[PDB]
Symmetry: C3
Subunit: 161 residues, 3 copies
C-alpha cells in the first residue's frame, strides 16, 4: 500500500438516499491521485457516503481513524448554513487537536474564487495519527481547497506519524 | 413584514446606564436598511441595549432567536480586550453551529482599515434559524464589517431557513 | 519594574531534558526588548523551559497569570502536528477569553514567509489580566509573529488592565 492512506467521505442525504450520484467524491479522488507524489506518496484507498447525520459521520470518522488506520480523511459536503449541514459538528466531536491553519488557508484561497466561500463552516484536526479535513460539497471546491493545502500537506502527514 | 427580520443589540454599560447615547446602533440600522435589497429583503424590526453582562446578553439572544423569530441578530460592542468585554462569551453559549467564515471575512477586511481590528474577539453562529454575528462597538466598524459580509449574507439567510 | 511584565515559556522536551540549548527563547527576549517602547514599556522579567507535557505547561501558565502577575506570556514551541505538540491544548485549558484576531494576524503574516505557517496550531487568549500567546518553536518564527502583532499589542495590553 501507499505511504499515506487517504479516505474520502461524501456527506450527503441525496447521494446516500440514491437520489443523485456523487460528483464531489470522484473529483477529490482525482485531485489526491494526481498530487500523490507532492503529498509524499498518498493514495485514496477507500471512499464512502453517509447521510447528513451527526452520529453516522462520527461513527465512520472514528472507525477510519481508530480501526482502519487511515492517515488522511477528507470529508465532502455538509459544511454550509442549512439545518442539515452538520459535518463540522460531527468532526469537532471526533478530533482531538484542532488544526486551524489548514482552515485559514482553505478560506483565504477559496475567497479569491467566490465570496460564498465564507459560508463554509469546515472544521479540521487530528485524531490519533489521522488528519481529518472538512471540504465543501461543491464539486469544484475540493480541487481549490487541496491546491491551498498542497504546499504543506506532505509535511503535515509526516509530522502526525 | 420583511423577508428577513433583523434585530440589533447594542452591548454597552455606558449606554445601558444612560451615561451616553447609542452611536453604533443607528449606524447598524442605516447600513442594513440601505442594503435591504442586497440582503434579500431585510429590515431592522427591533433594537435593544443591554449592559456588558453575560446573562443579560444571553437572555436577549435566546429570546430573539427562540421566541421572537428573528432571522439575523447583529450585536455591537463588547468584543475587545477589556475585562468587561464579554459579548463573544455570551454569544458562544447561545449559538449551536459556529460560522467561522463570517469572522474570517470581517477580520480580513477590517485589518485593511486598521491594525486594531485584531483586538475584536467577535463570535458568530447559528441558533435554530437565526444567524448571530458580533460586531465591534466602534460606530464605523459595523459599516466596514457589513460591507465585508454583504456579498454572501443573502445566501446565508436563505440557507438558514 | 516595567509597565508590562513579559514572561517567555519555551516548550520543548529537548531543551527541558538538556539535549540541546534554547534558541527560540533568546530570540523572543530580543524581539520584546527591542520593541519595548512600541509595546508601551514592556520588559521580559522571567523565562522558563518546560517539556511537551500538558500539565507542566498549564501549571506554569496558571502560576504566572494568577500568582506572579505577568501581563504577557509568550510560549514558544509545541504548536505543530506531531503527537508531542500539545501547547495549544494546554493553553486552551487556562485561557478564559479567546483572542482569535491575534492568531489571524500571526497566520496571515507568517504565510507570506512560508506555507508551513499553516502547520502552527497556536492558541491565544486572556486569563485575568494576562494575555497568553502561542508562537511556533522555529527560532525565526517569534520575530515574524511579533512583527505581525506589534501594531496593536500595546493597545491590547492597556485594555486588559
Ligand atoms: N473553494 C470553494 N469553497 C466553497 C465553495 N462553495 C461555497 C462554500 N465554499 O461552501 C459552502 C458550504 O457548502 P456545503 O454545505 O459543504 O455544500 P453542500 O450543501 O453539501 O453542497 C453544495 C451544493 O453542491 C452540490 N453537491 C454537494 N455534494 C455533492 C454535490 N453534487 C454532487 N455530488 C455530491 N456529493 C449540491 O448541488 C449542493 O446543493 C457554500 S453554501 C458555498 S456556495 C466553492 O465553490 N469553492
Ligand atoms: N472594522 C473595524 N473593526 C474594528 C474597529 N475597532 C477595533 C476592533 N475592530 O474592535 C476592537 C474591539 O472593540 P469593542 O470592544 O467591541 O468596542 P467597545 O469597547 O464596545 O467600543 C469601543 C469604543 O467605541 C465606542 N462605542 C462602543 N459602543 C458605542 C460606542 N459609542 C457610542 N455608542 C455605542 N453604542 C466607545 O467610545 C468605546 O470606547 C477594538 S478595541 C478596536 S480599536 C474598527 O474601528 N473597525
Ligand atoms: N512565522 C513562522 N511561522 C511558522 C514557522 N514554522 C512552521 C509553523 N509556523 O510552525 C509549525 C509548528 O511548529 P512547532 O511545533 O511550534 O515548532 P516545534 O516542533 O516546537 O519546533 C520546530 C523546530 O524548531 C526547532 N526548535 C523549536 N524550539 C526550539 C528549537 N530550536 C532551538 N531551541 C528551541 N527552543 C527544532 O529543531 C524543531 O524541530 C511548523 S511545523 C512549521 S515548519 C516559521 O518558520 N515562521
Ligand atoms: Cu452555497
Ligand atoms: Cu480599541
Ligand atoms: Cu515544520
Amino acid at each position: 500500500g501507499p505511504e499515506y492512506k487517504v479516505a474520502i467521505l461524501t456527506v450527503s442525504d441525496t447521494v446516500s438516499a440514491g437520489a443523485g450520484p456523487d460528483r464531489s467524491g470522484p473529483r477529490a479522488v482525482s485531485v489526491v491521485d494526481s498530487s500523490s507524489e507532492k503529498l509524499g506518496g498518498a493514495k485514496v484507498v477507500a471512499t464512502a457516503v453517509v447521510p447528513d447525520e451527526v452520529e453516522r459521520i462520527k461513527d465512520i470518522l472514528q472507525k477510519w481513524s481508530d480501526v482502519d488506520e487511515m492517515d488522511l480523511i477528507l470529508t465532502l459536503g455538509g459544511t454550509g448554513f442549512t439545518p442539515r449541514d452538520v459535518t463540522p459538528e460531527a468532526t469537532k466531536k471526533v478530533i482531538e487537536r484542532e488544526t486551524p491553519g489548514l482552515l485559514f488557508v482553505m478560506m483565504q484561497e477559496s475567497l479569491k474564487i467566490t465570496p460564498f466561500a465564507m459560508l463554509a463552516r469546515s472544521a479540521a484536526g487530528i485524531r490519533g495519527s489521522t488528519l481529518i479535513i472538512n471540504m465543501p460539497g461543491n464539486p469544484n471546491a475540493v480541487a481549490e481547497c487541496m491546491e491551498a493545502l498542497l504546499p504543506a500537506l506532505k509535511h503535515a502527514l509526516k509530522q502526525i506519524k
